[PDB]
Amino acid sequence: MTTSGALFPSLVPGSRGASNKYLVEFRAGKMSLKGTTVTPDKRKGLVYIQQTDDSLIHFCWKDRTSGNVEDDLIIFPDDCEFKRVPQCPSGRVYVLKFKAGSKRLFFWMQEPKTDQDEEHCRKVNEYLNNPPMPGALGASGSSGHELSALGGEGGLQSLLGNMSHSQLMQLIGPAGLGGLGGLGALTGPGLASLLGSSGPPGSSSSSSSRSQSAAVTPSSTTSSTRATPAPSAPAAASATSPSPAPSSGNGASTAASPTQPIQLSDLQSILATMNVPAGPAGGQQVDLASVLTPEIMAPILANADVQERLLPYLPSGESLPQTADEIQNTLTSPQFQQALGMFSAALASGQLGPLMCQFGLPAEAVEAANKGDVEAFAKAMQNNAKPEQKEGDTKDKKDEEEDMSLD
Q1: After what residue numbers is the chain broken, C–N > 2.5 angstroms?
Q2: 47 closest CA partner among 75, 24, 68, 31
Q3: CATH code: domain of residue 323
Q4: Contact of 40 with 108, CB cutoff 8 Å
Q5: Residue 122 belongs to a domain with what CATH number?
Q6: What domain range includes position 71?
Q7: What is the CA radius of gyration of the chain?
């Protein structure tokens, strides 16, 4: 014997008395590449945020169709930023941008009430900014250097030595530059620190040595002004709340809105070479497939003269359709965007031009196609997407025939 047989304290207790599992949890889904085309993954999902035992932020997305974990990442302090997409009409689409790597995961909120929209964003982005007091960050005071940081070549120099005897002459320019940028900076003011750089009154100097205020006296006496002052109050025109409207960017719409990328043109180019199933010389290739849709492009891309310009410019890893009853009926999306993008490259060069004349496309598109104006070609085919009028059936103005009616 050792004890009794009336044992009870050998079944373990639980918790649920302020012992939370997660830092943040909310209903949201995401978008994914289905090839070159991005599509929403229209499952019910959950995003959640948790802390690691190393004291970093663990971010996770899970399914609610069966309940599976689908994606998870440990994120370092400041390494990501979560923001709402401004191009969204409702506001429910969001983006987690990774500042290292240039990766963007586009999310979409599946919470019904939009009253919590900014509240979830704030809670997420505060944990990405401020971690729950880690000690695993490291230290650097007078050490912390990598002696190579891997291999594969670096671009810190163009050549290690340049072979040039004639290297004494400087590059000649059309004007030059002076000392702008070497102004001296702030050294630490005391006499005007936060004052605004103003000086003392000018009423204290009253010597009266000169009193010149006019020289418009060629006849000497010209004192025709008897007793009529002119204060001259408005020295300049100004407004407290100006609001432009004529706003032009070289055209009254063309670049009048802000279209400048935040380095995104270079970042999307390297991503297209590294992992994204896109083209680095493209972007427009993916968009024009929504404008020049399969119904119009079916007999065009089914012609051999177009295929013989697409096929040799193909980068390998794709095989386009060859007949119109494939293109009009049997498609996904990426294959058509690849076809549209190789088409637009040959069109923009001008050499595809002659075929548009042979197919029988609109005269404004046929003109644009032979120049290489893909923007005007797309606009012409979008505006003239109709037959010989469709905005009323009353274009049938027959007024009888008497046989002798053909001349």
Answers
A1: none
A2: 24
A3: 1.10.2020.20
A4: yes
A5: 2.30.29.70
A6: 21-133
A7: 36
